[PDB]
Design a protein around this ligand. Structure first.
Ligand SMILES: CCCCC/C=C\C/C=C\C/C=C\C/C=C\CCCC(=O)NCCO
Length: 136
């Protein structure tokens, strides 16, 4: 029973964020800033209801969803695309498919220990992020 992802999470690694961004057509100048940043993720979870905020000094991004309920996602200030997003549970892994103009776009997020893992995929590019839980 590791579906509880509540907390504030601080990035410790960000593998192939460059390639993921390039697959989303983010311009070089934006990538130059974005690749350098430590991100923080705040997850406020009540059962299958999630409110998430991802922050950095350069851009912030909020997305709220209920597991199992498809929603309209506009990736404002990121790549600024519209997708149909669906989050499901695969075991205790949170899986999101972002159906739209990019093939094989989605993410997967899960807990191990005091770490949160987030794998983001677009096309043939996978970005692997690891976050450590912040003490309250
Ligand atoms: C918000 C700080 C990062 C700002 C980056 C600025 C410009 C790069 C442009 C496009 C790259 C695309 C997504 C950023 C990666 C990760 C952001 C979170 C993606 C999510 O949906 N996670 C699941 C939340 O439940």
């Amino acid at each position: 029973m590791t579906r509880d992802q509540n907390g504030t999470w601080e990035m410790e690694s960000n593998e192939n964020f460059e390639g993921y961004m390039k697959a989303l057509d983010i311009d070089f100048a934006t990538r130059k800033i974005a690749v350098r940043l430590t991100q923080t993720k705040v997850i406020d979870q009540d059962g299958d209801n999630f409110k998430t905020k991802t922050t950095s000094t350069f851009r912030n991004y909020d997305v709220d969803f209920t597991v199992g309920v498809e929603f309209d996602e506009y990736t404002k200030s990121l790549d600024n695309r519209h997708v149909k997003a669906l989050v499901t549970w695969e075991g205790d892994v949170l899986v999101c498919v972002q159906k739209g103009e990019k093939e094989n776009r989605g993410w997967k997020q899960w807990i191990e220990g005091d770490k949160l893992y987030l794998e983001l995929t677009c096309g043939d590019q996978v970005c692997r992020q690891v976050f450590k839980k912040k003490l309250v």
